[PDB]
Design a protein around this ligand. Structure first.
Ligand SMILES: CC(C)C[C@H](NP(=O)(O)[C@H](Cc1ccccc1)NC(=O)OCc1ccccc1)C(=O)N[C@@H](C)C(=O)O
Ligand SMILES: [Ca+2]
Ligand SMILES: [Ca+2]
Ligand SMILES: [Ca+2]
Ligand SMILES: [Ca+2]
Ligand SMILES: [Zn+2]
Length: 316
């Protein structure tokens, strides 16, 4: 859409009011011209055909319940672009300011969200297991981070490389949640999962076992479902990342925490410079150690905490 940049206001899925970047050309569109080559949000109209219609509104006010998921997908995608730019100096997911596209109201009662190799897609959930998925900033950032991975390491979505792919998305979705300071935590999906149960989440990084995910390599899932447990074994890496940042004793192994910022710097460097499509857990360990070495020196405490954290989860 070619038009005049302006700012509209709406309410998100959680009932929170926010300003969003729109474009005016007869209607007001969910097109933010301020970030890279733009951020664009589409209405999939309960169908599965993508992307759907660029979101158009008559008055630049998005307070209807139908508007909620589009407001949050549009606004959180803005925050995520900013995190990447400001913190890691990366311009959009491809590093060359590629337009970011998202479709909301995808299918009927669809309990998931994904990156399809071209855009982000969000279901509205069925109202019980999930509310519309774009209402969680860790969710939006998890999705966008799959694009990041797609353009850098390219980790294949199966087995070990696939669980690394998922962990990276959980790690960066969490870093983005802390960056926006939106009630942050080490839980995934808490804001949009089981609206009727408080205190739970989809996955836990601090304690993956809490929901039955492995927190040690010896407890790795070897089966075939979930692409070989991409969403299951990611708990072993999530726990490792949580220990590097926060510290703790796990299975008798003590880890001094080095904090979140350094965790983000070490992981980003591993992702962009050392990981490949078929990298496994042991290779992730070498990649993380080498990044911390690059950045802080072989004799750093940073390097020391990365080795302990992997030794704690039984990776090497
Ligand atoms: C953060 C949470 C809310 C959403 C997140 N979705 P997700 O981001 O893990 C979504 C899962 C999926 C896979 C295939 C089809 C459709 C959906 N996968 C996805 O987007 O995969 C990225 C990918 C890119 C290229 C090739 C292959 C894969 C998730 O953990 N989903 C769990 C519930 C699951 O799918 O098992
Ligand atoms: Ca309106
Ligand atoms: Ca939170
Ligand atoms: Ca969270
Ligand atoms: Ca819940
Ligand atoms: Zn994922």
């Amino acid at each position: 859409i070619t038009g005049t940049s302006t700012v509209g206001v709406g309410r998100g899925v959680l009932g929170d009011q926010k300003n969003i970047n729109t474009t005016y050309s007869t209607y007001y569109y969910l097109q933010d011209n301020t970030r890279g080559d733009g951020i664009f949000t589409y209405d999939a109209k309960y169908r599965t055909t993508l992307p759907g219609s660029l979101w158009a509104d008559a008055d630049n006010q998005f307070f209807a319940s139908y508007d909620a998921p589009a407001v949050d997908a549009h606004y959180y995608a803005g925050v995520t672009y900013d995190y990447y730019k400001n913190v890691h100096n990366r311009l959009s997911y491809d590093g060359n300011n590629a337009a970011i596209r998202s479709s909301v109201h995808y299918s009927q009662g669809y309990n998931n969200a994904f990156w399809n190799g071209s855009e982000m897609v969000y279901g509205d959930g069925d109202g019980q297991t999930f509310i519309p998925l774009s209402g969680g900033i860790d969710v939006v950032a998890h999705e966008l981070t799959h694009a990041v991975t797609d353009y850098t390491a390219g980790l294949i979505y199966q087995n070990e490389s696939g669980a690394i792919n998922e962990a990276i998305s959980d790690i960066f979705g969490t870093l983005v949640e802390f960056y926006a300071n939106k009630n942050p935590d080490w839980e995934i999906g808490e804001d949009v999962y089981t609206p009727g149960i408080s205190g739970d989440s989809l996955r836990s990084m601090s304690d993956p076992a809490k929901y039955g995910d492995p927190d040690h390599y010896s407890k790795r899932y070897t089966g075939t479902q979930d692409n070989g447990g991409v969403h299951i074994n990611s708990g072993i890496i999530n726990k490792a990342a949580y220990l590097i940042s926060q510290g703790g004793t796990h299975y008798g192994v003590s880890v001094v925490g080095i904090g979140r910022d350094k965790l983000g710097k070490i992981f980003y460097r591993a992702l962009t410079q050392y990981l490949t499509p078929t990298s496994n857990f042991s290779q992730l360990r070498a990649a993380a150690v080498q990044s911390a070495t690059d950045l802080y020196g072989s004799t750093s405490q940073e390097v020391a905490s990365v080795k302990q954290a992997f030794d704690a989860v039984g990776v090497k």
